[PDB]
Nucleic acid binder design. Structure first.
Ligand SMILES: Nc1ncnc2c1ncn2[C@@H]1O[C@H](COP(=O)(O)OP(=O)(O)OP(=O)(O)O)[C@@H](O)[C@H]1O
Ligand SMILES: [K+]
Ligand SMILES: [K+]
Ligand SMILES: [K+]
Ligand SMILES: [K+]
Ligand SMILES: [K+]
Ligand SMILES: [K+]
Ligand SMILES: [Mg+2]
Ligand SMILES: [Mg+2]
Ligand SMILES: [Mg+2]
Ligand SMILES: [Mg+2]
Ligand SMILES: [Mg+2]
Ligand SMILES: [Mg+2]
Ligand SMILES: [Mg+2]
Ligand SMILES: [Mg+2]
Ligand SMILES: [Mg+2]
Ligand SMILES: [Mg+2]
Lengths: 50, 124, 119, 55, 49, 402
RNA sequence: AAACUCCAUAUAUAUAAUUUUAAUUAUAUAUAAUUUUAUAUUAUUUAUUAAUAUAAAGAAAGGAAUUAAGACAAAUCAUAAUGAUCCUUAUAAUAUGGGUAAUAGACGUGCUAUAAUAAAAUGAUAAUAAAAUUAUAUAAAAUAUAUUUAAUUAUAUUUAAUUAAUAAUAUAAAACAUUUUAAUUUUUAAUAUAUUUUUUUAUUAUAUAUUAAUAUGAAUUAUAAUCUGAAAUUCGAUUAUAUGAAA
């Protein structure tokens, strides 16, 4: 069954790149929070996939 | 002759593997179950606050699409949250091979059976 | 604008913080005691104060050593050092550091503030 | 914390007596520390070696 | 563009900016057009080997 | 000005709470919450009734940081092990004094909102203290009352009294005729200069009139004592007294207020603290036998040995400093026979129901719907949420863009 | 010279009566890679070949040390040592105090800061480390004072355990959650209002100045107390109250 399933992607390349550009001083958690909160606000105004 | 003996489940059906990342170490007990996880006796959301650390632990189970087929009792010590979460990730991948040795190639290809060697280097 | 003893305060300013900011000799601990004594709740603001309460603050402020009186005490302690001819007194007269700081470099603030008639 | 201080002081005094300890309830500086410090003279005075070497 | 908005929280300013861009309005499309105009002018300067 | 009428100027937590972002949500038709017909709604996501929404908004049952803006109106999953279990004990137990516990984000506030919804349906008068920190943080006025020997807080009491009036059915309040005559100072800006006082005669005026008395700030403490006394003497209508974030009270023995000697004021020296603990301890007894007292802790507050000892979970350690153990609160809680109800974590079937509702609400990302098998999603989200934590489940679905 | 090697990493054996517990460990020995294999493609000096991709196997991904020659007659006679030359009641030796800490300008290297992708509080069945140190010691808990219920911080009193995989220095910190935050009328308050209630809306009041220094910043300075020492004046460290510069 697994032979025909692609290995799931570890991470999203674009989101990881955007997060690291926001990040400073190694504070990745803060950077991920800012992006997720910003994308959460985009969904709540557009109601589409941010 | 060789020094390798086939790994097998113990008397309680548990696969025990050890993993290391940075200064952290993790000893996990994997048994067939329904997806229950305990880290040092604590809930996963309690011990690991970062969702990215939780996702790293789940990745090996996501590769073999067996996230709801095993109960994990992970014990970890040393380093910080990232080292411990990825040390558990490495140990779960090594413990899952006993349940089905045919999936080792998929685990190796995903990169979860490789021990990360990077550690803090004294400046030279 | 609320005026207490000449000082002007913006309405939004918190009383305990404003008092320790505009009045010489009153710090954070002293300001909190004044507010506690007058029945002002911890985070009350200036615009809330009534005229009877503004007079009560001025009364309590007038029974303390603040403003000129407090500044005079510092000016008189510095003058005494010069009068007795102590090493520290000379430093104040020469506009040099008085607490052992090196002078080969830096010492800029002591050059602007150290004086017998210290502000 | 609810144990009366008088009761806890009686225990401290008796305990100190049994264990030959100095009981100073007031807290006055007594110099007992000076009387208990170790003598470092012998170690300090041997820094440069034993002087009674064959010459 | 986000840092010109009024919110004290960067997440709010970033969210608002991303919402406006997803709805078509953005002042950075002018920057892109000006970078592409310059490149079209210097098309002959390309080497192609 | 830099701020325009519609500009989002607040921080993220307040913007999501206040920016009315649910307006764009898609209207869904869900069953209504009714405990009398729980059999038809058990283990299903339900909305509240129109009468329940109005009361719960005035009580403060819905709070910020609950992802309520994702849906047109706040919704709740009727659970068997949390909602049905707790509500059955509330209807059967004779004491009816409970404290809701559980790990942070497990759903303690939602359970309390479901108890408020039940009370509204069952014709009860709800007195809710949503955020006790408001009367302990020292950010509103306080005054000492000589006749009560307590520190009254007029600003806070005015807000509380209006909430009790706007959140409860006027008919229920009108049914409770007054038992004593009351006189207060008149602060109504219409006849205050004509009528020095407003009199409330017994058997003629009701508790509804008492909740509409406009008095001076210095006499507002005596109005709160009358309202509680009138509601504690009547036996017609059950009174449900609730306090969310009660852990704040247990861990803040001394408020931020300071007396005239710059000494912090003990929380039980405030009328709000004394009133709250009199109802919990049993000093203030309610005549009606269906009256209840439901308390809920919050994970945003610090923990110490006070609550565990009061609940009998650990032995009493006398040498614990007062900052980590308040023996007076333990005595009051144990005098009231308060019982603990721990909110369990969600099971995998309950996670399936919540994620199936989220799919219909269009709140799930495209990475969890396209190219992923439904069974895999449920297993992954049950693992990433700590095996049931509702708050970690929502964050994994709507607040994890990695 | 490279290397061989040692280290790290992976694994095996041995050792521990698994309470010196970290067996998820410790440290002796040995093994392992300078990875290997096939497959298609592209070039070639086309062959018993390279560059790529592809599948397969594997834990496998990083470091070290030392020198061969020569130059700057580069630094050091102040780490110590040698020749020459000079001093020998002094250029040698000891004690007291002072200086090496002076202050116009200039230069190098650092620390702190100039606020909201960032600072400040709080988080006790105590989120989560590593490597070191303790017989010329490391100092627990407790109590007392600053000081207030307590906590926190500082010191005193007292001196438990450990000379150590045992006890102590020492509950790592950031993180994360909540609260707060001048500039900012983006606030607060009084009424009324709401199906946003830790909140919305309405009407009033909430300052003036202002390219600017605040609830940022912590230099400077007054006073009191403490710590080490025989001794803190030139010239040490810490705390409290007050001061609050430049930026
Ligand atoms: N039964 C439920 N149905 C739907 N959502 C729920 C339910 N229980 C909890 N949630 C959601 O889980 C999150 C946390 O809920 P809630 O705020 O009630 O938890 P809590 O334990 O009281 O939180 P805290 O520890 O912060 O006080 C919210 O997003 C809430 O909407
Ligand atoms: K001042
Ligand atoms: K000097
Ligand atoms: K310099
Ligand atoms: K000297
Ligand atoms: K700052
Ligand atoms: K000195
Ligand atoms: Mg809650
Ligand atoms: Mg062990
Ligand atoms: Mg020098
Ligand atoms: Mg600072
Ligand atoms: Mg710990
Ligand atoms: Mg101690
Ligand atoms: Mg901690
Ligand atoms: Mg911190
Ligand atoms: Mg400051
Ligand atoms: Mg300036």
């Amino acid at each position: 069954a697994l032979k025909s399933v692609p290995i799931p992607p570890r991470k999203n390349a674009t989101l990881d790149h955007i997060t690291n550009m926001i990040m400073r001083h190694g504070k990745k958690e803060k950077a991920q929070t800012i992006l997720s909160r910003a994308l959460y606000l985009v969904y709540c105004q557009t109601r589409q996939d941010p | 002759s060789n020094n390798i003996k086939i790994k097998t489940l113990d008397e309680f059906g548990r696969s025990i593997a050890v993993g290391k990342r940075k200064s952290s170490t993790a000893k996990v007990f994997v048994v067939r179950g329904t997806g229950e996880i305990l880290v040092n006796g604590r809930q996963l959301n309690d011990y690991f606050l970062k969702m990215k650390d939780r996702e790293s632990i789940m990745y090996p189970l996501q590769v073999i699409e067996s996230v709801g087929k095993y109960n994990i009792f992970a014990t970890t010590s040393g380093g910080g949250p990232t080292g411990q979460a990825e040390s558990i990730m490495h140990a779960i991948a090594k413990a899952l091979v006993v349940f089905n040795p045919l999936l080792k190639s998929r685990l190796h290809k995903a990169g979860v059976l490789t021990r990360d060697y990077r550690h803090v280097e004294r400046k030279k | 604008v609320v005026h207490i003893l000449g000082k002007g305060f913006k309405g939004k300013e918190v009383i305990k913080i404003a008092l320790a900011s505009k009045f010489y000799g009153i710090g954070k601990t002293t300001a909190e005691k004044i507010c506690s004594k007058l029945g002002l709740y911890p985070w009350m603001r200036m615009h809330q104060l009534s005229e009877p309460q503004i007079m009560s603050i001025a009364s309590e402020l007038s029974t303390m050593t603040i403003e000129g009186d407090a500044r005079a005490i510092v000016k008189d302690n510095i003058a005494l050092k010069r009068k007795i001819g102590s090493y520290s007194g000379m430093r104040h007269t020469l506009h040099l550091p008085v607490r052992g700081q090196h002078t080969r470099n830096n010492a800029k603030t002591a050059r602007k503030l150290n004086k017998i008639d210290r502000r | 914390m609810n144990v009366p201080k008088a009761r806890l002081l009686k225990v401290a005094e008796l305990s100190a007596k049994i264990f030959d300890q100095n009981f100073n309830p007031s807290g006055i500086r007594t110099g007992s520390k000076i009387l208990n410090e170790r003598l470092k003279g012998p170690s300090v005075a041997s820094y440069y070696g034993n002087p009674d070497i064959l010459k | 563009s986000a840092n010109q908005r009024v919110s004290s929280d960067f997440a709010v300013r970033l969210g608002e900016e991303l919402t406006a861009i997803a709805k078509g309005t953005s002042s950075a499309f002018e920057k892109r057009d000006q970078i592409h105009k310059t490149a079209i002018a210097h098309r002959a300067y390309i080497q192609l080997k | 000005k830099r701020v325009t009428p519609g500009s989002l100027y607040k921080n993220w937590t307040n913007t999501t709470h206040t920016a009315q972002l649910q307006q764009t949500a898609v209207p869904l038709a869900l069953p209504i919450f009714n405990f009398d017909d729980i059999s038809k709604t058990l283990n299903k996501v339900v909305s509240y009734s129109n009468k329940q929404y109005k009361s719960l908004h005035h009580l403060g049952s819905f709070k910020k940081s609950q992802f309520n803006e994702l849906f047109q109106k706040p919704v709740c999953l009727v659970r068997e092990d949390a909602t049905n279990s707790f509500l059955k004990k509330l209807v059967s137990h004779p004491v009816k004094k409970f404290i809701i516990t559980g790990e942070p984000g497990v759903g303690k506030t939602v359970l309390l909102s479901q108890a408020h919804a039940y009370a509204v349906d069952s014709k009860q008068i709800i007195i809710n203290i949503s955020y006790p920190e408001l009367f302990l943080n020292g950010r509103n006025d306080f005054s000492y009352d000589d006749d009560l020997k307590l520190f009254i807080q007029p600003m806070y009491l005015k807000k509380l009294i209006r909430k009790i009036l706007k959140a409860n059915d006027p008919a229920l309040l009108k049914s409770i005729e007054l038992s004593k005559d009351y006189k207060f100072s008149n602060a109504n800006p219409k006849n205050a200069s004509v009528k020095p006082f407003v009199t409330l005669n017994k058997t003629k005026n009701t508790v509804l009139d008492l909740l509409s008395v406009m008095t001076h700030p210095h006499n507002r403490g005596k109005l709160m004592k009358a309202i509680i006394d009138e509601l504690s003497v009547q036996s017609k209508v059950p009174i449900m007294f609730t306090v969310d974030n009660f852990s704040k009270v247990l861990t803040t023995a001394y408020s931020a207020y300071r007396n005239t000697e710059n000494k912090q004021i003990y929380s039980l020296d405030l009328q709000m603290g004394k009133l709250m603990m009199d109802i919990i301890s049993g000093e203030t007894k309610f005549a009606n036998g269906e009256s209840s007292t439901i308390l809920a802790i919050s994970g945003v507050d610090r923990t110490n040995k006070t609550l565990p000892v009061a609940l009998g979970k650990i032995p009493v350690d006398p040498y614990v400093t007062r900052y980590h153990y308040e023996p007076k609160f333990v005595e009051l809680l144990q005098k009231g026979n308060v019982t603990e109800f721990e909110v369990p974590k969600l099971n995998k079937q309950e996670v399936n129901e919540l994620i199936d509702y989220y799919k219909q609400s269009n709140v799930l990302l495209d990475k969890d719907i396209t190219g992923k098998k439904w069974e895999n999603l449920i297993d992954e989200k049950y693992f990433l949420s700590g095996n049931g934590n509702p708050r970690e489940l929502l964050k994994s679905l709507v607040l994890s863009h990695r």
